[PDB]
Amino acid sequence: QPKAAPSVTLFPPSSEELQANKATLVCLISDFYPGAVTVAWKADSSPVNAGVETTKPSKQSNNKYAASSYLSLTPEQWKSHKSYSCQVTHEGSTVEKTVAPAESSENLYFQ
């Protein structure tokens, strides 16, 4: 069970939660340590740490563990920035990603 570099994938909030004034970030993590990592997030200027849920990992076809984190914040908080970044700690290594999600998609509106 050697070292495994985790993946980083940021996704926009769901319309279901958005409509109700809510946004939950999703961080896809695969091919990493055996359920051993550090959950961390980064916002526009103010970095995040607490208020994030972590679901138990799961072995893959290659025995590689896969997990994901969820950030609990308002829809306006994320909407303030163009894209979010998910910090993934591994073997003493931390990396973040940045990508702006589609706009055409439905967002927080007057239900």
Parse the chain into domains and list their residue ranges.
10-95
Residue among 46, 99, 35, 44 nearest 68 (CA): 35
Q: Round to whole Å and give the CA distance between 72 and 87.
A: 15
Q: Is 7 within 8 Å of 30 (Cβ atoms)?
A: yes
CA distances to 7, 45, 66, 97 from 35, in Å: 13, 29, 8, 21
Q: Helix, strand or coil for residue 19?
A: helix
Q: Is 66 within 8 Å of 29 (Cβ atoms)?
A: yes
Q: Round to whole Å and give the CA distance between 38 and 46.
A: 18
Supply the DSSP symbol for 104: S
Measured in whole angstroms, the distance separating CA 77 from the mean position of its chain's CA atoms is 15
CATH class of domain segment(s) 10-95: mainly beta
In DSSP notation, 21-76 reads T-EEEEEEEEEESSS--EEEEE-SSS-B-SSEEEEEEEE-TTS-EEEEEEEEE-HH
Q: Round to whole Å and give the CA distance between 76 and 65.
A: 33
